[PDB]
Amino acid sequence: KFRERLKELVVPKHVMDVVDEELSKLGLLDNHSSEFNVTRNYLDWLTSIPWGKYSNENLDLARAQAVLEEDHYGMEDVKKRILEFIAVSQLRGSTQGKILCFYGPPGVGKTSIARSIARALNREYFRFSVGAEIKGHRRTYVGAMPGKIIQCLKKTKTENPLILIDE
Amino acid sequence: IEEKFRERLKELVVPKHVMDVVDEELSKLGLLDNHSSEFNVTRNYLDWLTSIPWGKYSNENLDLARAQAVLEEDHYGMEDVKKRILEFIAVSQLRGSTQGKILCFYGPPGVGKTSIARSIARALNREYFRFSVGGMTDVAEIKGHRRTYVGAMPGKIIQCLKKTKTENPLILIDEVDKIGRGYQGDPSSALLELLDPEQNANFLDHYLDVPVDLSKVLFICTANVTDTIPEPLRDRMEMINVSGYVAQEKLAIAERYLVPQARALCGLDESKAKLSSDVLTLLIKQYCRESGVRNLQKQVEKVLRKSAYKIVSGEAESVEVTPENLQDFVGKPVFTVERMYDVTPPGVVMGLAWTAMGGSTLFVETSLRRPQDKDGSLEVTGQLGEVMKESARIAYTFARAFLMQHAPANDYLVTSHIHLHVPEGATPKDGPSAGCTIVTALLSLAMGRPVRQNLAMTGEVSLTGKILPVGGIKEKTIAAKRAGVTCIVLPAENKKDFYDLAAFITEGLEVHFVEHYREIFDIAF
Ligand SMILES: Nc1ncnc2c1ncn2[C@@H]1O[C@H](COP(=O)(O)OP(=O)(O)OP(=O)(O)O)[C@@H](O)[C@H]1O
Ligand SMILES: *[B]([O])([O])[C]([C][C]([C])[C])[N]C(=O)[C]([C]C1=[C][C]=[C][C]=[C]1)[N]C(=O)C1=[C]N=[C][C]=N1
Ligand SMILES: Nc1ncnc2c1ncn2[C@@H]1O[C@H](COP(=O)(O)OP(=O)(O)O)[C@@H](O)[C@H]1O
Ligand SMILES: [Mg+2]
């Protein structure tokens, strides 16, 4: 069923390459052993993170202003700045470049504003705190886990989420 | 082998994300051979997996009256903590199922922080578990080791879940400020993973390697000082301050718990060694003036062991402890006289101070420095801080002004060279209070009149004569009561602080709340 877990999903070439290679290498090894489960979990990780799955971006500025104004009473200046950022992104075609940053006294609405931004752009929200570890470990059974960004991709099952690097 | 492990998964509710794991592992025992190392590795791995209490709880007592009774049985009046536990029960009962908080008690040594967790777990009917964290260097105690290693083991929290046979225990994590910070595996980060409600729902132990749901446990942390608790850890706890006790609280605690336990230990009953309550009051007053109760317990044990020696050495056959021969049992008193002046001369006035060992009572002596009644001066001694010297200057100016407006032909305080001293010259002292005390000292020196005898006053004064609030009203009132003051004077803006004190503290005190200094003058004369 692993092929079904990425059938309808658009896959690149050099990814299906490693997928088939690991399936053949897993047919080689013996099932239910200290060599089989490792490669099984790795091939699971290859077939879990999306490749062609997206989220239709919310480009409209009126809907964005509405979803920003619903929550977060006040903040009119931060709201104006966010609207202007979305306008520049819509006019530039993309959203890369500078990375936004909110700073101020504590308990003022800097995490919830990022959640509301994510809800605005219809991007899937994900937060990971940086208060090495963002790159994952290696498969010598020491760290059998990918990084937190790969887990973001798996969780949100969308290639364009909104990750929040809090604090 | 398989039969017992699959039977053990009967009275539980095993979640799927671990039921498939235990099934995959069971599928290996049939293949492996009973002689191999992998066999025993997976055998005790399955032992650990099936021994975890996967869905069961305890019959948590959500009755409020019973919880209050069992809380008030074990300890004497730690109300700020019992109130929190009762509100926790009330909330956990309003919103349906059992809950889990992360509380932290901080305070001086010996106030009951660690001692109360067991009675709290008895009140909630939970399974109490405790482990100290001070001095801990490695994360393997919190996390554990990968079961690949030879003698791998789960760790303290999984062992707690196995030993309590429940997954809503009360885990007392003791000494969370003395936690070591060896960065080659930092235990503070494991403690953050434990005490972080957003992620403690999946506590991934390095041995189990399946997440456990630790969101229904009541973590309680104990600290002596909060300023060395890691900041991220401190930002996930409810700091509840367990303060010290006063003479009457200490007496109740002694009579109810400390003396009976010390009698059970030393083997003396009230027929052999009589510790009356007057002796205990004198002891608490002159020897044990700290915040906790460990020193008082040691003093009680001291008296009891000396009486025990008097009996065993065949000398007394019975020991009567009277307030006259207490020195023979405990030595020289630490605090003796409580006041330096019995009747105050025209110049000196009693003030009140704050200290960690209860309050204090200091006097403000003033004296003519040169022979006379070009302007007068003020020399100020007594190890005074900058704020206190400035407040003395302010009090001097206002005293000049007030004496000019009150008795315009006095000429004192203007042409006289005065020396102001706050005795006990060795100890340093600071604070904006005693401004009214200094004004009163100067005025009583200028008019040649001693103030009311049993009168004490605290309060900041401004240049126009307004009386401003001060701090430490509890200790100052305790000190004035202890020294035999009948009339106390406080700023009018400390009325709430004074009426917030326990009733026995302010029993026979005649308090006066003032706004300006003219009222203090009308009272002190
Ligand atoms: N309010 C109280 N009522 C009854 N007994 C008390 C009270 N406060 C303390 N005790 C007794 O005194 C002892 C206090 O020791 P405890 O373990 O509470 O200290 P602690 O709060 O952990 O301080 P530290 O952690 O700084 O040593 C306990 O044995 C307890 O029985
Ligand atoms: B006051 O509240 O400012 C007061 C004035 C005192 C010197 C008559 N100061 C103190 O009580 C200080 C503690 C303090 C409290 C608040 C602010 C600053 C300082 N106490 C002492 O200085 C002291 C001195 N000797 C013995 C005991 N206490
Ligand atoms: N303008 C606002 N409108 C509504 N809720 C707010 C607003 N500002 C702050 N809050 C609330 O206060 C809390 C702020 O915490 P948060 O902003 O996450 O802390 P930090 O700013 O340190 O990240 C949030 O729970 C948020 O709901
Ligand atoms: Mg303790």
Domain ranges of chain B: 64-241, 247-330, 349-524
List the resolution, Å. 3.2
What are B346's two structure tokens? Answer: 């025209």
Treating both helix axes as pointing N-terminal to C-terminal, what angle do B294-312 and B259-266 enclose, rounded to 10 degrees? Answer: 40
Judged on CB neighbours under 10 Å (0-12, 13-18, 19+), B191 is buried
Contacts of residue B388, Cβ cutoff 8 Å, sequence gap at least 6: B429, B430, B431, B432, B434
One-letter amino acid at B134 equals G
B26, B29, B30, B36: CA torsion to nearest 10: 170
Give the whole-angstrom CA distance, residue A14 versus residue A26. 18
Q: Given ligand 2 and candidates B354, B360, B437, which is best to mutate, with the most ligand atoms within 8 Å of its CB?
A: B354
Alpha carbon B179 to its chain centroid, in Å, reads: 20
Residue with tokens 């009214």: B436
What are B90's two structure tokens? Answer: 């009330």
Is A30 in the B-facing interface, judged by CB distances under 8 Å?
no
SS3 assignment, position A164: strand
Q: Do B148 and A131 touch (CB under 8 A)?
A: no
Tell me the CA distances in angstroms from B64 to A41, B2, B84, one per residue in order.
Answer: 50, 45, 12
What are B56's two structure tokens? Answer: 């069961």
Give the whole-angstrom CA distance, residue B213 versus residue B202. 5
Give the whole-angstrom CA distance, residue B385 versus residue A136. 57
Q: Which of A129, A139, A166 to mutate to test the interface with B (most CBs of B within 10 A)?
A: A129
Which method was used? Answer: cryo-EM
Give the whole-angstrom CA distance, residue B233 versus residue B173. 13
One-letter amino acid at B10 equals K
Residue with tokens 């055998």: B43
B312-320 CB contacts, 8 Å cutoff, 24+ apart: B318/B271, B318/B272, B318/B273, B319/B272, B319/B273, B319/B274, B320/B274
Treating both helix axes as pointing N-terminal to C-terminal, what angle do A13-28 and A36-46 enclose, rounded to 10 degrees? Answer: 160
Judged on CB neighbours under 10 Å (0-12, 13-18, 19+), A77 is exposed
Among the options B188, B307, B433, B444, which is catalytic?
Answer: B433
User: Is B476 considered catalytic here?
Assistant: yes
Ligand 2 atom having least distance to the Cα of B362: 8
Question: What residue ranges in A78-148 does DSSP mark as E strands?
Answer: 125-129
One-letter amino acid at A3 equals R
Give the whole-angstrom CA distance, residue A75 versus residue A81. 10
Query: In this structure, what DSSP letter does residue B79 have?
Result: H
Q: Do B24 and A34 touch (CB under 8 A)?
A: no
Give the whole-angstrom CA distance, residue A103 versus residue B479. 48
Query: In this structure, what DSSP letter does residue B339 have?
Result: -
Query: In this structure, what DSSP letter does residue B384 have?
Result: B
- Name the helix (H) or strand (E) containing A28: helix A13-28
B344 and B361 in contact (C-beta within 8 Å)?
A: no
| Total count of residues recorded for chain A | 167
Query: In this structure, what DSSP letter does residue A4 have?
Result: G
What are B276's two structure tokens? Answer: 């009356």
Give the whole-angstrom CA distance, residue B99 versus residue A121. 36
Residue with tokens 């105050």: B344
Q: How many CB atoms lie under 10 A from the CB of residue B301? A: 16
> Is the minimum distance from the CB of A131 to ligand 3 under 6 angstroms?
no
Q: Dihedral sign, CA of A72, A77, A83, A88?
A: negative
CATH fold group of domain B247-330: Helicase, Ruva Protein; domain 3 (1.10.8)
CATH architecture designation of domain A61-167: 3-Layer(aba) Sandwich (3.40)
A59 and A90 in contact (C-beta within 8 Å)?
A: yes
> Is the minimum distance from the CB of A38 to ligand 3 under 6 angstroms?
no
Return the bridge partners of B351, or none.
B362, B457
Tell me the CA distances in angstroms from B367 to A19, B331, B348, B378, one per residue in order.
Answer: 97, 38, 9, 10
Give the whole-angstrom CA distance, residue B183 versus residue B205. 19
Pocket of ligand 2 from Cβ distances under 6 Å = B 351, 353-355, 360, 362, 388, 427, 429-434, 470-472
Annotation: binding site of A: 104-111
CATH fold group of domain B349-524: Ribosomal Protein S5; domain 2 (3.30.230)
Tell me the CA distances in angstroms from A84 to A60, A61, A79, A81, B505, one per residue in order.
Answer: 12, 9, 9, 5, 63
Is A141 in the B-facing interface, judged by CB distances under 8 Å?
yes
Alpha carbon B410 to its chain centroid, in Å, reads: 52
Which class is domain B64-241? alpha beta
> Is the minimum distance from the CB of A79 to ligand 3 under 6 angstroms?
no
Give the whole-angstrom CA distance, residue A143 versus residue B346. 82
User: Rg of the Cα trace of chain A?
Assistant: 20
First and final C-alpha spacing in chain B? 93
Contacts of residue B445, Cβ cutoff 8 Å, sequence gap at least 6: B346, B347, B366, B367, B368, B412, B418
- Name the helix (H) or strand (E) containing B487: strand B487-491
| Total count of residues recorded for chain B | 525
CA of B174 to the centre of ligand 4 (A): 6
Among the options B250, B285, B476, B481, which is catalytic?
Answer: B476
Give the whole-angstrom CA distance, residue B419 versus residue B380. 6
What are A83's two structure tokens? Answer: 């609207």
B251 closest CA partner among B395, B76, B415: B76
Give the whole-angstrom CA distance, residue B190 versus residue B144. 11
For ligand 2, atom 6, name the residue with the nearest CA.
Answer: B353
B404 and B446 in contact (C-beta within 8 Å)?
A: no
For ligand 4, a single-atom ion, the residues with CB < 5 A are B 114
